Amino acid sequence: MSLAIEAVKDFLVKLQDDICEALEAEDGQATFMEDKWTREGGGGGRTRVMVNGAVIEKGGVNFSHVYGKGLDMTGCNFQAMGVSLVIHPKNPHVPTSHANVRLFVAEREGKEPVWWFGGGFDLTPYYAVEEDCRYFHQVAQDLCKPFGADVYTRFKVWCDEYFFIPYRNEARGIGGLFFDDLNEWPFEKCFEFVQAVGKGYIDAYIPIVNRRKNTPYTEQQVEFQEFRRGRYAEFNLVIDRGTKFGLQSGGRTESILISLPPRARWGYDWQPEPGTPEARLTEYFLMKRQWV
Amino acid sequence: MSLAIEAVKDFLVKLQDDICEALEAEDGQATFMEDKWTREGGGGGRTRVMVNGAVIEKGGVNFSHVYGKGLMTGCNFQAMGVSLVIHPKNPHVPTSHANVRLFVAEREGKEPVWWFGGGFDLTPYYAVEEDCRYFHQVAQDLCKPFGADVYTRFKVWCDEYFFIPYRNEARGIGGLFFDDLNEWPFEKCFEFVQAVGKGYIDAYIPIVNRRKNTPYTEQQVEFQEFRRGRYAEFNLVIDRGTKFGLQSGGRTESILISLPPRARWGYDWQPEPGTPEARLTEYFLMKRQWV
Numbered sequence: 098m099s100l101a102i103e104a105v106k107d108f109l110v111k112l113q114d115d116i117c118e119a120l121e122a123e124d125g126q127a128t129f130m131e132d133k134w135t136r137e138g139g140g141g142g143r144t145r146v147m148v149n150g151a152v153i154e155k156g157g158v159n160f161s162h163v164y165g166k167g168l169d170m171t172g173c174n175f176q177a178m179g180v181s182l183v184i185h186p187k188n189p190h191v192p193t194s195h196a197n198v199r200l201f202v203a204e205r206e207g208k209e210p211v212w213w214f215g216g217g218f219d220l221t222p223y224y225a226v227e228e229d230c231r232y233f234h235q236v237a238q239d240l241c242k243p244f245g246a247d248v249y250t251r252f253k254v255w256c257d258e259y260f261f262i263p264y265r266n267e268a269r270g271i272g273g274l275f276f277d278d279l280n281e282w283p284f285e286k287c288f289e290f291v292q293a294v295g296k297g298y299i300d301a302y303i304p305i306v307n308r309r310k311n312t313p314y315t316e317q318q319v320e321f322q323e324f325r326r327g328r329y330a331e332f333n334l335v336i337d338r339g340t341k342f343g344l345q346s347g348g349r350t351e352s353i354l355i356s357l358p359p360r361a362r363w364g365y366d367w368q369p370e371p372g373t374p375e376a377r378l379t380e381y382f383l384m385k386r387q388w389v
Numbered sequence: 390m391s392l393a394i395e396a397v398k399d400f401l402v403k404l405q406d407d408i409c410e411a412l413e414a415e416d417g418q419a420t421f422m423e424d425k426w427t428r429e430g431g432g433g434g435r436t437r438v439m440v441n442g443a444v445i446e447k448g449g450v451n452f453s454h455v456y457g458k459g460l461m462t463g464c465n466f467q468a469m470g471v472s473l474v475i476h477p478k479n480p481h482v483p484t485s486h487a488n489v490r491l492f493v494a495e496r497e498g499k500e501p502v503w504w505f506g507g508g509f510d511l512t513p514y515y516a517v518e519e520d521c522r523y524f525h526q527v528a529q530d531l532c533k534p535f536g537a538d539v540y541t542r543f544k545v546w547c548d549e550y551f552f553i554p555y556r557n558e559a560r561g562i563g564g565l566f567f568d569d570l571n572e573w574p575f576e577k578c579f580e581f582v583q584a585v586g587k588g589y590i591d592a593y594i595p596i597v598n599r600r601k602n603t604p605y606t607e608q609q610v611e612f613q614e615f616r617r618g619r620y621a622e623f624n625l626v627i628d629r630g631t632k633f634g635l636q637s638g639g640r641t642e643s644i645l646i647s648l649p650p651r652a653r654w655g656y657d658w659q660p661e662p663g664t665p666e667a668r669l670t671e672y673f674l675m676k677r678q679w680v
Contacts, residue, residue: 146656155655310622330654334622334625347554347555360653360654361651365449385573
């Protein structure tokens with residue numbers, strides 16, 4: 098399946114381009130800076146990063162083709178290619194977001210290639226808006242419609258289960274889609290599904306940036322944003338499996354940690370003030386888990 | 390064992406009071422706030438923290454004594470210890486950390502399995518030559534009577550443990566680290582941890598005094614904050630006690646006192662070459678030879 102892989106690479110390259118261009122247009126001011134790299138004895142990647150925009154303070158949209166020999170498949174030729182992104186806006190009234198689309202292929206002697214897709218997208222509000230949370234989920238529900246009646250529900254749930262900090266009993270955001278080990282449908286339907294997912298992120302997230310980017314904000318709201326960003330760093334550094342594999346397997350550190358916020362705050366037993374719009378993020382929005 | 394294990398407990402209760410009082414004396418303005426907590430299963434602890442003092446911006450010095458049934462399979466256990474992390478306001482005062490603890494697993498019929506663990510370490514931002522070697526000389530001196538290879542073994546261990554491998558970067562200038570310490574009689578291992586606990590006060594407090602009044606600027610605070618992303622990373626990604634505590638039902642906020650009050654991250658962020666900032670990772674963190 099070398100031709101399938103080439104088709105998938107080409108899609109991801111174009112997806113990265115389209116996602117960067119969409120965000121650039123919406124930012125108006127900053128542009129993404131390209132960083133092409135390689136790894137000894139493996140493939141490499143293209144890391145595109147935006148800093149200090151009029152909207153996006155720290156954005157990353159990375160492509161990587163990771164390789165290697167050896168991960169029953171134990172010494173199998175393993176291969177992973179995907180696009181990963183995290184956008185951290187300046188204005189707390191614009192949510193942070195994240196998306197992933199990735200293919201994994203493992204090849205053995207005397208076996209057909211084992212392949213699966215993975216990915217999803219999700220929204221991480223600070224000062225959430227009811228209309229945006231359901232809109233975000235509606236986009237996700239709509240794109241799933243052609244692929245099965247269970248597909249939104251299954252991957253919406255997976256997203257809630259995965260993006261969870263068990264030790265704080267707390268969701269990371271309001272969810273969206275998450276899936277892994279996807280190979281239950283023929284390859285082509287799977288590939289179309291991740292294509293829809295990549296398209297979905299733009300359809301879901303960009304309008305929300307447009308609606309909210311000019312909401313006025315105070316230094317107090319920035320401060321809360323930064324404490325909420327401690328929760329983001331905690332998940333990525335302690336829990337997230339991809340980040341954990343990337344760092345422990347000697348992947349490209351700065352390409353892997355584009356996810357981290359431009360600044361974070363921690364305090365002993367820090368809690369938002371009760372009865373505020375700050376408290377309602379965790380008391381209501383991160384708790385509802387029912388949007389469509 | 391019981392009265393020996395209790396002597397250790399009494400030492401750790403006193404050690405927290407002593408460290409906290411020493412740090413309050415250095416600050417002058419702010420005082421530790423105690424949060425007494427109990428663990429479902431047996432025991433608990435006292436978490437003391439200091440915020441927004443003249444010297445210490447975020448400090449935490451914890452004591453705990455946890456015990457109960459089952460983990461040495463299905464053994465009754467006792468775990469006790471003091472751990473601390475101090476993050477000063479002035480970038481010219483280093484961050485520091487210390488830990489001393491005992492674990493005991495008792496067995497019907499047989500003697501208990503036990504070991505000690507702990508150490509201390511210095512994480513400067515604007516490091517100074519004479520402070521790095523003072524810190525290690527306190528370390529070397531306290532070790533000396535215990536044996537000719539104690540400082541070197543545990544100084545080398547400290548370098549090996551507080552190391553961010555994916556960044557090829559030490560967390561700081563090191564100090565002492567040890568775990569699984571039961572190769573000597575209990576009494577001696579015990580005296581060793583008491584020497585380590587006291588060593589932290591002799592090593593760190595004079596450094597706070599020398600540097601606290603050093604002038605600093607918002608730019609050096611910026612550097613301090615990018616460096617504190619490295620600190621958060623090691624604790625959240627690598628540190629064993631932290632990982633373990635968060636995963637297995639430790640008390641979250643007591644475990645995460647180690648985190649900085651503010652951290653920064655930037656894509657491929659590096660200090661400017663040829664500056665005191667660059668000299669941190671180029672010289673001080675690479676030397677690893679201070680006595």
